[PDB]
Amino acid sequence: MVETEPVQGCRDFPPEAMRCRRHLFDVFHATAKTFGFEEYDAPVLESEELYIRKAGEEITEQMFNFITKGGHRVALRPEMTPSLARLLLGKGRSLLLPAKWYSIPQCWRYERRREHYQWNMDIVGVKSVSAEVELVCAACWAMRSLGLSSKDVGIKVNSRKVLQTVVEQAGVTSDKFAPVCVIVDKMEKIPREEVEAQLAVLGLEPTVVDAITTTLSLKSIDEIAQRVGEEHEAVKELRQFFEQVEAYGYGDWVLFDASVVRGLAYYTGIVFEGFDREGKFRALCGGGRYDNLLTTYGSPTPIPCAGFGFGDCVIVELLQEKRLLPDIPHVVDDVVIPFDESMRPHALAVLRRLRDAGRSADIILDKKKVVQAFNYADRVGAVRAVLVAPEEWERGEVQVKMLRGFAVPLDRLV
Amino acid sequence: MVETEPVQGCRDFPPEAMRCRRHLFDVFHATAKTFGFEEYDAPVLESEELYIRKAGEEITEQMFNFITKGGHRVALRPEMTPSLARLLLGKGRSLLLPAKWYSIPQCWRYERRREHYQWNMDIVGVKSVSAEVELVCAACWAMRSLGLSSKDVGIKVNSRKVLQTVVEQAGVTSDKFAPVCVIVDKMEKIPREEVEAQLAVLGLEPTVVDAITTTLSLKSIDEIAQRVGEEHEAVKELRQFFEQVEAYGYGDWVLFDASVVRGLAYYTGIVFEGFDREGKFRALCGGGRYDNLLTTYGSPTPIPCAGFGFGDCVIVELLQEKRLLPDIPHVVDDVVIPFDESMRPHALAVLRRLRDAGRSADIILDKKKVVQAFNYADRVGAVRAVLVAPEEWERGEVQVKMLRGFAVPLDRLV
Numbered sequence: 001m002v003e004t005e006p007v008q009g010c011r012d013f014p015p016e017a018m019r020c021r022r023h024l025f026d027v028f029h030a031t032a033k034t035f036g037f038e039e040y041d042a043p044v045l046e047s048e049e050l051y052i053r054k055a056g057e058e059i060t061e062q063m064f065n066f067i068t069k070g071g072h073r074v075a076l077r078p079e080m081t082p083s084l085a086r087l088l089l090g091k092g093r094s095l096l097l098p099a100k101w102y103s104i105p106q107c108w109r110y111e112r113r114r115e116h117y118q119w120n121m122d123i124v125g126v127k128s129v130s131a132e133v134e135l136v137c138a139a140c141w142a143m144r145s146l147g148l149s150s151k152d153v154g155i156k157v158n159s160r161k162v163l164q165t166v167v168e169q170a171g172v173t174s175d176k177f178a179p180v181c182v183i184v185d186k187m188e189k190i191p192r193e194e195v196e197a198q199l200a201v202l203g204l205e206p207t208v209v210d211a212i213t214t215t216l217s218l219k220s221i222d223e224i225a226q227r228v229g230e231e232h233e234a235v236k237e238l239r240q241f242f243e244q245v246e247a248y249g250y251g252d253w254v255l256f257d258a259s260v261v262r263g264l265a266y267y268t269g270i271v272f273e274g275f276d277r278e279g280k281f282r283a284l285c286g287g288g289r290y291d292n293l294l295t296t297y298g299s300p301t302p303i304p305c306a307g308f309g310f311g312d313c314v315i316v317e318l319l320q321e322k323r324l325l326p327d328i329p330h331v332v333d334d335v336v337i338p339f340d341e342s343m344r345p346h347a348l349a350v351l352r353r354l355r356d357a358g359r360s361a362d363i364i365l366d367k368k369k370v371v372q373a374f375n376y377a378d379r380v381g382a383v384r385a386v387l388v389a390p391e392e393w394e395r396g397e398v399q400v401k402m403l404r405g406f407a408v409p410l411d412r413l414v
Numbered sequence: 415m416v417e418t419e420p421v422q423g424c425r426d427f428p429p430e431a432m433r434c435r436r437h438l439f440d441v442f443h444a445t446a447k448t449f450g451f452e453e454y455d456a457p458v459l460e461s462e463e464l465y466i467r468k469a470g471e472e473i474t475e476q477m478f479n480f481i482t483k484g485g486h487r488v489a490l491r492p493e494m495t496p497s498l499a500r501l502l503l504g505k506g507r508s509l510l511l512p513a514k515w516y517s518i519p520q521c522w523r524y525e526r527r528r529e530h531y532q533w534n535m536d537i538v539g540v541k542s543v544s545a546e547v548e549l550v551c552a553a554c555w556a557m558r559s560l561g562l563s564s565k566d567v568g569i570k571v572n573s574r575k576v577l578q579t580v581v582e583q584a585g586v587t588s589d590k591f592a593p594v595c596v597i598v599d600k601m602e603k604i605p606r607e608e609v610e611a612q613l614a615v616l617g618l619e620p621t622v623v624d625a626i627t628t629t630l631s632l633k634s635i636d637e638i639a640q641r642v643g644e645e646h647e648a649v650k651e652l653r654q655f656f657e658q659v660e661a662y663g664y665g666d667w668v669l670f671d672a673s674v675v676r677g678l679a680y681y682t683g684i685v686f687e688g689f690d691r692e693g694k695f696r697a698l699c700g701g702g703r704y705d706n707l708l709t710t711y712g713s714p715t716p717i718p719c720a721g722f723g724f725g726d727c728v729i730v731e732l733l734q735e736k737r738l739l740p741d742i743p744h745v746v747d748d749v750v751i752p753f754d755e756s757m758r759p760h761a762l763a764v765l766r767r768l769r770d771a772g773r774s775a776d777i778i779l780d781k782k783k784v785v786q787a788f789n790y791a792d793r794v795g796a797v798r799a800v801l802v803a804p805e806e807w808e809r810g811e812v813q814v815k816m817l818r819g820f821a822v823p824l825d826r827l828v
């Protein structure tokens with residue numbers, strides 16, 4: 001035999017598993033359309049340039065890359081956001097803004113699974129927190145559409161500006177801010193002592209760290225205000241954020257967590273994460289504001305951006321745990337059963353009529369006995385079995401039977 | 415700047431181009447559902463083993479492949495059919511047959527464009543030509559659904575068994591039959607003299623070639639019969655085929671062409687190609703019967719298979735040529751315009767109501783003047799603009815205006 005298992009770390013999607021994936025993707029699509037985003041795509045294979053940010057990131061560290069025969073540096077994309085930036089940047093003044101773009105790219109890592117699908121939603125050209133508000137509400141919407149509630153999940157929200165103020169006041173050149181987020185992002189996962197030591201390696205001093213941990217463990221926006229001011233950008237922003245989410249009707253879904261930073265270098269302002277309220281699973285989704293990526297890529301004018309990624313794995317685990325992923329059995333409207341081979345030409349004409357009317361229909365393709373054909377109809381989840389027999393055809397009729405046996409005229413079938 | 419162009423031979427799909435791709439994919443999906451096929455997927459990255467057939471094929475020759483860091487032979491799939499076989503074979507006795515599986519994989523080649531999307535439709539477990547009939551009718555259906563007619567296109571049909579009989583009677587061991595098809599497949603593309611010389615290289619003699627070209631240029635099924643018999647498999651098959659397609663209502667779409675072989679090694683019986691009736695474009699789609707692939711992959715019992723691939727490029731060129739690809743402008747049902755920032759909380763509640771009712775709606779995310787907001791609504795193709803102003807909100811109303819301005823109650827919006 002040839003190897004029937006897929007390549008290391010990659011999933012097969014036979015029809016059963018594919019119905020589960022469609023169930024999910026359908027929601028990502030429907031949500032995106034509900035929120036007015038526009039679909040886009042770009043190649044899974046990008047130039048390796050695009051992902052060299054040098055902030056010790058997990059996503060750049062764990063990169064599926066290789067060299068073409070021509071000697072060019074390429075890589076299977078680990079995330080979408082850089083591809084988006086390339087596209088947006090490719091369009092100059094010609095891109096109407098604001099722009100709301102979404103996609104469901106397969107993304108790759110080398111190491112544990114090595115690929116996944118990630119819904120991406122991004123808003124371009126909106127300075128205000130109204131964008132983050134929309135994005136966060138989109139993630140909730142999607143989760144709600146999958147049957148989840150604010151009892152089951154929520155979205156932790158923060159701003160990196162708070163910590164930016166604190167880092168800056170510590171005398172630390174602003175270049176250090178990206179690696180500091182990537183290290184502090186590991187605060188939950190790994191112990192307190194082993195995070196400290198990373199910051200010491202990147203040249204930071206002890207009193208400047210104290211203020212980091214303290215601010216990380218601040219429990220409220222009012223507590224942040226005490227430390228930084230009530231008309232600091234972040235406080236006004238976050239109050240506006242929570243006020244807007246409150247008004248849209250999703251206030252029970254969102255909450256402030258000062259420990260939330262995310263592990264990506266490019267986030268400048270608000271950042272967020274979906275999580276289950278039982279503490280069982282990793283982040284359901286993740287995003288934030290990244291107002292300087294496109295300047296970094298060489299845009300002559302800075303372009304404000306915000307968005308998120310919502311993976312295809314954790315959501316499923318969670319939906320299984322909550323018994324919200326029932327087997328989706330296959331369905332087709334009609335199965336057309338010729339009484340025998342002499343009725344095939346006639347069964348085809350029937351098949352053609354049914355399909356013309358927008359119905360999904362099979363016709364039995366092999367030579368088989370009526371009861372075996374009917375069993376088959378049940379097995380593939382036919383709503384209806386349509387028997388084409390010679391005695392009924394002579395009368396201009398067929399025999400129909402609902403699975404979930406009467407004589408019926410041809411016109412009246414549809 | 416970073417490089418804004420995609421990697422060599424790969425396409426970007428910004429929203430405009432993506433709407434064109436959805437237009438097409440929608441039809442592939444809808445057709446598949448109409449014909450009762452089940453979606454599946456597998457990884458774009460496969461083991462290179464899977465494609466070593468050694469019949470001098472163009473698809474194996476032009477393979478996008480590389481080695482992982484672990485030293486394993488892998489490759490971006492050039493086609494789907496081998497992946498399908500792996501899947502089908504992975505399921506043993508447990509796969510209910512017949513099975514009808516479809517997918518729209520991106521496929522890859524190294525060399526001219528290096529990737530494309532290819533609708534795949536395959537039927538597994540059906541001995542009879544009813545499968546090829548269904549497949550061919552599916553391809554037509556799809557093309558018809560894109561606005562094309564039998565005046566514009568058709569599907570040339572043949573059987574490799576005819577040539578098999580002729581090759582065998584020439585004393586040529588059956589091993590030679592796969593390379594002979596791959597060479598003769600180049601009969602249209604390259605000149606008569608340069609095809610002859612390929613067959614001479616693979617050890618064939620002169621009189622055996624004469625019979626090949628003559629049979630290739632036979633113009634009718636009746637002419638084939640003269641040469642091989644009226645109850646040769648192929649003649650009975652093809653008559654059954656054309657009779658069945660005739661009965662389904664698509665007889666004007668299909669026709670016999672003895673020169674049709676396809677360039678793939680695995681086809682055993684009936685084979686077909688879509689083409690434009692003006693002689694301008696390459697093959698729109700291509701397929702056939704491959705009853706021994708799964709035996710070749712190590713199946714303990716032979717499993718009959720048939721199917722086709724339908725690329726995303728030629729169809730588009732053709733649809734453009736026939737003016738059947740109009741710009742699909744963006745649409746959204748509602749754009750919600752707060753009179754000003756003090757009306758935002760209220761505009762959100764409105765936004766929430768609209769979306770709850772299944773409508774697609776935006777809300778203006780930046781701070782902007784009403785007329786600029788309304789311009790924007792037009793630019794993104796809003797069907798309707800919904801103005802949330804303080805005088806109307808106090809009355810429990812909004813101002814609605816159709817783009818393709820009245821006071822309206824909130825309940826009555828939906």
Ligand SMILES: N[C@@H](Cc1c[nH]c[nH+]1)C(=O)O
Binds near residue numbers: 079080287308309
């Ligand atoms: N690229 C981010 C998600 C994101 C989309 N837009 C902004 N952020 C991630 O992989 O987590």
Ligand SMILES: N[C@@H](Cc1c[nH]c[nH+]1)C(=O)O
Binds near residue numbers: 495534702
């Ligand atoms: N794999 C074939 C198409 C096909 C699908 N099933 C059978 N044949 C191609 O690339 O042309």
Ligand SMILES: Cc1nc(N)ccc1Br
Binds near residue numbers: 115116
């Ligand atoms: C979980 C994950 N994250 C990435 N960034 C890329 C692939 C995979 Br799998």
Ligand SMILES: Cc1nc(N)ccc1Br
Binds near residue numbers: 528530
């Ligand atoms: C036209 C084409 N054919 C393949 N087999 C693979 C990629 C591409 Br592009």
